[PDB]
């Protein structure tokens, strides 16, 4: 198997130097020319440069011609993106790949082309105004008209968090049947919101131990609040 | 440099077969490198066809890309379609100095049957009020098909500022869920009357109201 | 050194005056001039005391 | 006092090359004599090689002629090994040694060679294919009918986790009194399987606390796992 | 290429002298160099004897040491033994062609009464199952001499593969605890009716056999 591995991206201040890299596994890395792609969330893909398997041609864009610089390491089998002067739009995962076809050609044009069949695990660059501020964490009871062999929706609710990403695993990954974690939510005051539940039988009520995981990593806070339904006591 | 254009959104029911109109307005595309990719909202994109009619491991058979010679555009043909395919299609390609991007689509697999929208509002709460930040919560759950439009109001007056329509997503039921929020400050809370989140659902408007007697 | 008979005058010089809140350490060789009151609560100050 | 420290082999792919090592204090290390031996699990003890006090001398066995060098630094006062293309035979618990002094003999006909009058502490070696995996740990409660005057049985058990060393210790190792670690075993797919269980009143069940203390460094893992009563309610 | 030949074990009363044998299938070690060394179970080995009536330090003076030439042997005396140093003897020297090892002999002296053997059956963990884990475990402890054999079987038909044993090591109360491990799979695991552990100590034998159903 041929795989590639990307980090690097997170928090970042805006105008500053950044350096990236993109790792491999699988395949003869010098015989190959390499990529740097990025994919924007809520938008689509942002083709950055490309280069030559032995880094005499390079490609690049207009939209950020000269601004970023790009490079590649033959005998340490990594590929580098020294990427600057960072803006509102950037914010985007960078995606590593591997070229399809080296240098094909119609028959009378002859150019190193693009084409990825095989992409990497992705690392994304936090450029933002709001900053890496921690949640608050509300649990999510279900309410009692879902009783006598129903089913109660039930788990926590994460409001107001920043950055991405967060997973959410029912029983620390010991339940996976009904998870199902709706994404994030960008508000107007530049957080973050989701919700995510298990579908169970109402028979459980009063028996199955609820305690939901949040893992909210690149801020790395965790909630363990004791999961029940809210008692009905005046 | 150049630019393709691509249909936003396109239903189809998964028995027949859809085409996209991968139409590069200037230049011309003909002898030259052809790229085609599929996004599964929420993750990163699978290639589709390069080169004409080339397909990767594991995608089913069904896809089938094309080139209109004549009108300098490019389409794809996928028959038998599935629920499983409701996706994002893009458009790229290289031109001999840089690569171009398409509008984006959504592909809608009309297999199901449409949900009626029905919705419910979360108010803010009173402790949090005492630092002069609330945010007005809206859930949508339960519509078909997923294209949806989501739009604010304030006293009928449109609302334009911290407007945030998120994306809609797949449900355990096979229907579609988002929500959408609005950060206002208390001033702006009390003042207007009242507000409103107008949501439409395929031409029919869903919409419920919140009310400050719940505020204090 | 000692500047009582440079730098006093009679009834009490008020022209030297030194910054008590911040929101943060000031970084090395950093001056900052800002007159902005201070805020210890949720409620804007909006420039009065 | 005469003690000889221990550190460095371990996970290794077949075909590489690793530098173990040796050191001991409380003696002259220029002068005496050491010796190499590696232990095939189940197996009986095998010879290696051995170095004069010079640096000058070099003996070899059969197995690694040529394929392993040995070198000394009297300077640094520390032996060096060398092994080169791993064979999967190579897994055993390595065992740095001595001599009784510099090579000496007797009756005219005699060689620069003697006993092993010390032994190391070991250095267990891993050539194999599977990769770092983290440990995994489950609360195994005791029965509940173990009450009114017994003895009951629990613990922690330690699972698909790979390499070695584990640690397995009740209050971080202050309760001493009953814990016995069972051996580490292989299971089919590669990955080990083991037991460790603490010898406690029945009474102390749900009165004291109860945390194992699981310690797996070269994953830089730790696991506090608590033991409370099984809820095997309706 | 050579090899010294002594038993697996030897059990003998406390107040007995015991000795070992060191001989070698050919060559000739007369006048020659020699040593002994001991390893109680799992941890380092250590030294006994080096060139025959020899002591080192920190042992007790129950040991002898000779060598003989009418059979090619040396032998080590042990007079008045104890049950603190049960464990395995090896054998070395300096032979024609290289430094050579010995296959090694259990020591076992009889300082407690006997006792039948005690077989415990534990089958996957519930939580396991889902996981497609299995790992059969037999408990053998309490049992003396620490001498034990354990044997896998499915359905009266005897298991060889995913075999292992742990040697028993001593306990607080001078006993031995040893565990036997089997490598199975769920899908092999839950299709044999029955099994057996079998503990064959000292002809002494007490089988133990359960369901795989009690898991669920």
């Known amino acids: 198997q041929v795989q590639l591995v990307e980090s690097g991206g997170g928090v970042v201040q805006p105008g500053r130097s950044l350096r990236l890299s993109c790792a491999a596994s699988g395949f003869t890395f010098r015989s190959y020319g390499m990529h740097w792609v990025r994919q924007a969330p809520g938008k689509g893909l942002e083709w950055v440069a490309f280069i030559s398997y032995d880094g005499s041609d390079k490609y690049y864009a207009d939209s950020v011609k000269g601004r970023f610089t790009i490079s590649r390491d033959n005998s340490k089998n990594t590929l580098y993106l020294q990427m600057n002067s960072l803006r509102a739009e950037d914010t985007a995962v960078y995606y590593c790949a591997r070229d399809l076809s080296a240098g094909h050609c119609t028959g009378g044009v002859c150019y190193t082309a693009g084409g990825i069949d095989y992409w990497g695990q992705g690392t994304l660059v936090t450029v933002s105004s709001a900053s890496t501020k921690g949640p608050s964490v509300f649990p999510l009871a279900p309410s009692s008209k879902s009783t006598s062999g129903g089913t109660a929706a039930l788990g926590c609710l994460v409001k107001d968090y920043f950055p991405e990403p967060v997973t959410v695993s029912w029983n620390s990954g010991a339940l996976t049947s009904g998870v199902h974690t709706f994404p994030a939510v960008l508000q107007s005051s530049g957080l973050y919101s989701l919700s995510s539940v298990v579908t169970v039988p109402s028979s459980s009520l009063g028996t199955q131990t609820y305690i939901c995981n949040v893992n909210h990593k690149p801020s790395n806070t965790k909630v363990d609040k004791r999961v029940e339904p809210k008692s009905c006591d005046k | 440099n150049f630019m393709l254009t691509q249909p936003h959104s396109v239903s189809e029911s998964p028995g027949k077969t859809v085409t996209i109109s991968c139409?590069?307005?200037?230049?011309?595309?003909?002898?030259?490198?052809?790229?085609?990719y599929q996004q599964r909202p929420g993750s990163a994109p699978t290639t589709v066809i390069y080169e004409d009619n080339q397909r990767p491991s594991g995608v089913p058979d069904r896809f089938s890309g094309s080139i209109d010679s004549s009108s300098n555009s490019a389409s794809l043909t996928i028959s038998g379609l599935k629920t499983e395919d409701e996706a994002d299609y893009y458009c790229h390609s290289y031109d001999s100095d840089n690569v171009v991007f398409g509008g984006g689509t959504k592909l809608t697999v009309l297999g199901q049957p449409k949900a009626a929208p029905s919705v419910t509002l979360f108010p803010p709460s009173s402790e949090e009020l005492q630092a002069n930040k609330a945010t007005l919560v809206c859930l949508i759950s339960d519509f078909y098909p997923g294209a949806v439009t989501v739009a604010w109001k304030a006293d009928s007056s449109p609302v334009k500022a911290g407007v945030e329509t998120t994306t809609p997503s797949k449900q355990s039921n096979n229907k579609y869920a988002a929500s959408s929020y609005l950060s206002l400050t208390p001033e702006q809370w009390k003042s207007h009357r009242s507000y409103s989140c107008q949501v439409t659902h395929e031409g029919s408007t869903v919409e419920k109201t919140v009310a400050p007697t719940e505020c204090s | 050194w000692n500047s009582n008979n440079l730098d006093s005058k009679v009834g009490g010089n008020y022209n030297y005056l030194y910054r008590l809140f911040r929101k943060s350490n000031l970084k090395p060789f950093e001056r900052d001039i800002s007159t902005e009151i201070y805020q210890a609560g949720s409620t804007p100050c909006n420039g009065v005391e | 006092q005469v003690q000889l420290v221990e550190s460095g082999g371990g996970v290794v792919q077949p075909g590489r090359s690793l530098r173990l090592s040796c050191a001991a204090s409380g003696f002259t290390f220029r002068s005496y004599g050491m010796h190499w031996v590696r232990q095939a699990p189940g197996k009986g003890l095998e010879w290696v090689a051995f170095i004069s006090y010079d640096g000058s001398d070099k003996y070899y066995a059969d197995s690694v002629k040529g394929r392993f060098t040995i070198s000394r630094d009297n300077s640094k006062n520390t032996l060096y090994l060398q092994m080169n293309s791993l064979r999967a035979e190579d897994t055993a618990v390595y065992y740095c040694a001595r001599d009784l002094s510099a090579g000496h003999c007797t009756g005219g006909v005699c060689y620069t060679a003697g006993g092993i009058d010390y032994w190391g502490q070991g250095t267990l070696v891993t050539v194999s294919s599977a990769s770092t995996k983290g440990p995994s740990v489950f609360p195994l409660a005791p029965s509940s009918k173990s009450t009114s005057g017994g003895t009951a049985a629990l613990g922690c058990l330690v699972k698909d986790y790979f390499p070695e060393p584990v640690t397995v210790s009740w209050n971080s190792g202050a309760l001493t009194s009953g814990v016995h670690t069972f051996p580490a075993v292989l299971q089919s797919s590669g990955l080990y399987s083991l037991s460790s269980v603490v010898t406690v009143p029945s009474s102390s069940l749900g009165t004291q606390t109860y945390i194992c203390n699981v310690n797996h460094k070269p994953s830089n893992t730790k696991v506090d796992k608590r033991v409370e009563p099984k809820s095997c309610d309706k | 290429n050579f090899m010294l030949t002594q038993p697996h074990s030897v059990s003998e009363s406390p107040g007995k002298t015991v000795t070992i044998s060191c001989t070698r299938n050919?060559?000739?070690?007369?006048?020659?160099?020699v040593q002994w060394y001991q390893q109680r179970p799992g941890s380092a080995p250590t030294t006994v004897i080096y060139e025959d009536n020899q002591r080192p330090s920190g042992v007790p003076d129950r040991f002898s040491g000779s060598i003989d030439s009418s059979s090619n042997s040396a032998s080590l005396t042990i007079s008045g033994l104890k049950t603190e140093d049960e464990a395995d003897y090896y054998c070395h020297s300096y032979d024609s062609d290289n430094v050579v090892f010995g296959g090694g002999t259990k020591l076992t002296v009889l300082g407690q009464p006997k006792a039948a053997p005690s077989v415990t059956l534990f089958p996957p963990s519930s939580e396991e199952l889902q996981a497609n884990k299995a790992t059969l475990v037999c408990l053998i402890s309490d049992f003396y001499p620490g001498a034990v054999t354990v044997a896998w079987k499915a359905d009266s038909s005897p298991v060889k593969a995913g075999v292992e044993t742990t040697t028993p090591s001593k306990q607080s109360n001078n006993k031995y605890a040893a565990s036997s491990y089997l490598s199975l799979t769920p899908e092999q695991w839950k299709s044999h009716r029955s099994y057996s552990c079998q503990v064959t100590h000292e002809g002494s034998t007490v089988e133990k056999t359960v369901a795989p159903t009690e898991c669920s």
């Open positions: 050919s060559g000739s070690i007369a006048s020659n160099y």
